[PDB]
Design an enzyme around this catalytic site. Structure first.
Site, mmCIF file in Angstrom:
data_model
loop_
_atom_site.group_PDB
_atom_site.id
_atom_site.type_symbol
_atom_site.label_atom_id
_atom_site.label_comp_id
_atom_site.label_asym_id
_atom_site.label_seq_id
_atom_site.Cartn_x
_atom_site.Cartn_y
_atom_site.Cartn_z
ATOM 1 N N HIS A 1 0.381 -1.217 -0.075
ATOM 2 C CA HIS A 1 0.309 0.010 -0.069
ATOM 3 C C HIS A 1 0.385 1.185 -0.232
ATOM 4 O O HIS A 1 0.410 2.411 -0.226
ATOM 5 C CB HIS A 1 -0.737 -0.175 1.403
ATOM 6 C CG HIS A 1 -0.365 0.535 2.583
ATOM 7 N ND1 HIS A 1 -0.620 -1.249 3.245
ATOM 8 C CD2 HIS A 1 0.718 1.438 3.270
ATOM 9 C CE1 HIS A 1 -0.255 -0.298 4.805
ATOM 10 N NE2 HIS A 1 0.792 1.043 4.358
ATOM 11 N N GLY B 1 2.937 5.743 10.416
ATOM 12 C CA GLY B 1 4.894 5.849 10.019
ATOM 13 C C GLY B 1 5.647 4.214 10.172
ATOM 14 O O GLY B 1 6.668 4.305 10.338
ATOM 15 N N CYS C 1 4.497 0.744 9.632
ATOM 16 C CA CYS C 1 4.132 0.082 8.720
ATOM 17 C C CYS C 1 5.097 -0.330 8.049
ATOM 18 O O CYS C 1 6.481 0.693 7.668
ATOM 19 C CB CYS C 1 3.451 0.780 7.054
ATOM 20 S SG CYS C 1 1.471 1.605 8.056
HETATM 21 C C1 LIG Z 1 -7.591 2.153 20.698
HETATM 22 C C2 LIG Z 1 -8.122 2.686 20.100
HETATM 23 C C3 LIG Z 1 -8.315 3.035 18.913
HETATM 24 C C4 LIG Z 1 -7.781 3.882 17.780
HETATM 25 C C5 LIG Z 1 -8.786 5.063 17.121
HETATM 26 N N1 LIG Z 1 -7.359 3.635 15.660
HETATM 27 C C6 LIG Z 1 -7.571 4.371 14.737
HETATM 28 O O1 LIG Z 1 -7.695 5.647 14.572
HETATM 29 C C7 LIG Z 1 -5.710 3.884 13.422
HETATM 30 C C8 LIG Z 1 -7.211 3.499 12.036
HETATM 31 C C9 LIG Z 1 -8.415 2.359 13.198
HETATM 32 C C10 LIG Z 1 -9.547 2.870 11.253
HETATM 33 C C11 LIG Z 1 -9.099 1.145 11.278
HETATM 34 C C12 LIG Z 1 -10.403 1.379 9.594
HETATM 35 C C13 LIG Z 1 -10.399 2.816 9.297
HETATM 36 F F1 LIG Z 1 -11.569 2.295 8.435
HETATM 37 C C14 LIG Z 1 -10.630 3.941 10.034
HETATM 38 C C15 LIG Z 1 -10.191 3.458 11.469
HETATM 39 N N2 LIG Z 1 -6.309 2.955 11.417
HETATM 40 C C16 LIG Z 1 -6.007 3.610 10.452
HETATM 41 O O2 LIG Z 1 -6.289 4.612 9.857
HETATM 42 C C17 LIG Z 1 -5.236 2.674 9.449
HETATM 43 C C18 LIG Z 1 -6.653 2.640 7.745
HETATM 44 C C19 LIG Z 1 -5.777 1.845 7.198
HETATM 45 C C20 LIG Z 1 -4.581 2.177 5.751
HETATM 46 C C21 LIG Z 1 -4.173 1.293 5.426
HETATM 47 C C22 LIG Z 1 -4.634 -0.307 5.036
HETATM 48 CL CL1 LIG Z 1 -3.525 -1.358 4.160
HETATM 49 C C23 LIG Z 1 -5.110 -0.134 5.715
HETATM 50 C C24 LIG Z 1 -6.093 0.883 7.044
HETATM 51 CL CL2 LIG Z 1 -7.663 0.026 8.354
HETATM 52 N N3 LIG Z 1 -4.315 3.272 8.543
HETATM 53 C C25 LIG Z 1 -2.936 3.119 8.935
HETATM 54 O O3 LIG Z 1 -2.933 1.803 9.368
HETATM 55 C C26 LIG Z 1 -1.657 3.273 8.745
HETATM 56 N N4 LIG Z 1 -1.096 2.077 7.731
HETATM 57 C C27 LIG Z 1 -0.881 3.882 9.671
HETATM 58 C C28 LIG Z 1 -1.485 4.330 10.861
HETATM 59 C C29 LIG Z 1 -1.640 5.381 10.892
HETATM 60 C C30 LIG Z 1 -2.580 5.588 11.728
HETATM 61 C C31 LIG Z 1 -2.471 5.292 13.697
HETATM 62 C C32 LIG Z 1 -2.060 4.264 13.422
HETATM 63 C C33 LIG Z 1 -1.295 3.437 12.687
HETATM 64 C C34 LIG Z 1 -0.486 2.240 12.991
HETATM 65 N N5 LIG Z 1 -0.479 1.262 12.596
#
Ligand SMILES: C#CCCCNC(=O)C[C@H](Cc1ccc(F)cc1)NC(=O)[C@@H](Cc1ccc(Cl)cc1Cl)NC(=O)[C@H](N)Cc1ccccc1C#N
Ligand SMILES: C#CCCCNC(=O)C[C@H](Cc1ccc(F)cc1)NC(=O)[C@@H](Cc1ccc(Cl)cc1Cl)NC(=O)[C@H](N)Cc1ccccc1C#N
Lengths: 304, 304
Positions: free
Chosen positions: A41, A143, A145
């Site tokens: 990704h 970051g 990942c």
């Molecule tokens: C307690 C408790 C819960 C607290 C709140 N938790 C979050 O808000 C994390 C949040 C939860 C979430 C899941 C699905 C959604 F629809 C919307 C939100 N997850 C992300 O925003 C995903 C979205 C994503 C990006 C890419 C791919 Cl392939 C899949 C996925 Cl799901 N971003 C990441 O995982 C970054 N690569 C890396 C990253 C970014 C920001 C924060 C952490 C990380 C990590 N590690």
């Protein structure tokens, strides 16, 4: 004496961490010989992440769309391919710090060390288990990942995990180093749920054996139980069933302490039924389940 | 998201670990430039350990009584000296893997990473705090002596601890890298007792701030308290008094969560008085006190 959550020394993996950039997206990569491994990704924009077609997005890229940095020295990408959910970038330089290594796909309940990194630079190391629901309770910020999990065996680094995403509950999901997710997850920005977790029974028992080895005995009792009657209790408290293979794995610790496995099961059962009643075990007020039998033997002495 | 006991990446320290042998006694040493640092009781026999005179024992030694191994390559000792409780061995080769480094003597309540080693070879890494009674609750077996504790700051390694011994209670005592023990201890095989320990108040509060940053709020309340009334409660529960310098250190976390320090003190007070009542905080059933304010900021995000 003593008992700590212990990671493997991370230096052999530190010398493999690089930064991979594609467009505005940067994450971490793993540089072994002349190939850099990272989550696919990285080739996604914010818009592409909703429902990506990766074969489509990758066919639209060339080698020069990818920036690889090792330290400050930039590496030149001479080829690229996709394998399951990981991107492979061939570079012109073999990593001279490449350790002896293997890729392994682990079972739920096994543990490994995570070298958390940002922008290709290691920031910290900690211990993890693969939960029975195929997530890990990591510590990951945006970051992270591309950070990898690994075990070390006589200067061979066994990579078993690459970090990809955080789920809505705050737990983390990723792949083996060939890009296959652990569990049912997929790498799109949709809200996916893990199945309900369970406690890793064999590990709780290993840790009870660790406690005896370190002179903690208040929880033992004279009772023993049967494998079947214990599994009834395990079910009631959301513990994994205990298998005979798991009984046999615990052999060395059983022999070293003189406490038969099903003898320790009766203590666990009583612990499950009566709680700790304010006492602690190895400095913990709950039953710890992220130490394998192997972890206990490695960290503990050969004599109680 | 997530919150783990996190160590610094150990690679820079791994490349400094050597084995030091004198007679039948082997332990670990620290190889920086052309000097190897290790506990001085390496020059002791089993008989000498009861009540050693070290100036006496060292005057009876020559350079060739000391064996230094780095990997399999043996290093030649060209000089030796004693500084407080550490032995310094000058060797003919400067360690080419010498990181940028400093020696620092820490205060009780500060944390650091330990690279546990045996026979000069790193075996694992974990996080430690210096307890208020100047011991650490480590994980050390026979042969771990000479293992070091350290913090890392922008590729500068700050060494702050060298392991020397385990006390009767199973906790561990050692020195700064200039050989001065932490606490009242001395390096002879007599039974020495640590003073009674206390809980590191400022660290429990930092960790409560970590919990809020990760969305755990059930323990907060509307009440606030005064510094003096909180310290009465601290005394009652064997907590370190909270100083104004400690209030000020917690500033950044207070501002990032909107919860004033003395507001969090009222929650801690209530937690101390009422217990957890079966709930957990960041996956723990007791109040954790081995994370400093700095540790929380380093591992957590800049935004709740
Ligand atoms: C307690 C408790 C819960 C607290 C709140 N938790 C979050 O808000 C994390 C949040 C939860 C979430 C899941 C699905 C959604 F629809 C919307 C939100 N997850 C992300 O925003 C995903 C979205 C994503 C990006 C890419 C791919 Cl392939 C899949 C996925 Cl799901 N971003 C990441 O995982 C970054 N690569 C890396 C990253 C970014 C920001 C924060 C952490 C990380 C990590 N590690
Ligand atoms: C729960 C619980 C408690 C379980 C029982 N705990 C022990 O039996 C450890 C035991 C406790 C003890 C203390 C004072 C005594 F009089 C007699 C015994 N401590 C040792 O035997 C000291 C003795 C010693 C050697 C040298 C110097 Cl300078 C000072 C000291 Cl005190 N040996 C070491 O510390 C090794 N350097 C390194 C070493 C050896 C063996 C095991 C661990 C280590 C380490 N790490």
């Amino acid at each position: 004496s003593g008992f700590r959550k212990m990671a493997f020394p991370s230096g052999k993996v530190e010398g493999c961490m690089v930064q991979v950039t594609c467009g505005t997206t940067t994450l971490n990569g793993l540089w072994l010989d002349d190939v850099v491994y990272c989550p696919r990704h990285v080739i996604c924009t914010s818009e592409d992440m909703l429902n990506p077609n990766y074969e489509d997005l990758l066919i639209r890229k060339s080698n020069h769309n990818f920036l690889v940095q090792a330290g400050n020295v930039q590496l030149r990408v001479i080829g690229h391919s996709m394998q399951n959910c990981v991107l492979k970038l061939k570079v012109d330089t073999a990593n001279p710090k490449t350790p002896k290594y293997k890729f392994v796909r682990i079972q739920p309940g096994q543990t490994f060390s995570v070298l958390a990194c940002y922008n290709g630079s290691p920031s910290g190391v900690y211990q993890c288990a693969m939960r029975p629901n195929f997530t890990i309770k990591g510590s990951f910020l945006n970051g992270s990942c591309g950070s990898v999990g690994f075990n070390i065996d006589y200067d061979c680094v066994s990579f078993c995990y690459m970090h990809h995403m955080e789920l809505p509950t705050g737990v983390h999901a990723g792949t083996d180093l060939e890009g296959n997710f652990y569990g049912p997850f997929v790498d799109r920005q949709t809200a996916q749920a893990a199945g309900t977790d369970t406690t890793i029974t064999v590990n709780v028992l290993a840790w009870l054996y660790a406690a005896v080895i370190n002179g903690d005995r208040w929880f033992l009792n004279r009772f023993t139980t049967t494998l079947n009657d214990f599994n009834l209790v395990a079910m009631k408290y959301n513990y994994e069933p205990l298998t005979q293979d798991h009984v046999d794995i615990l052999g060395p610790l059983s022999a070293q302490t003189g406490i038969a496995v099903l003898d320790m099961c009766a203590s666990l059962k009583e612990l499950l039924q009566n709680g700790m009643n304010g006492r602690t075990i190895l400095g913990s007020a709950l039953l710890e389940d992220e130490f394998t039998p192997f972890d206990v033997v490695r960290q503990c002495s050969g004599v109680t």
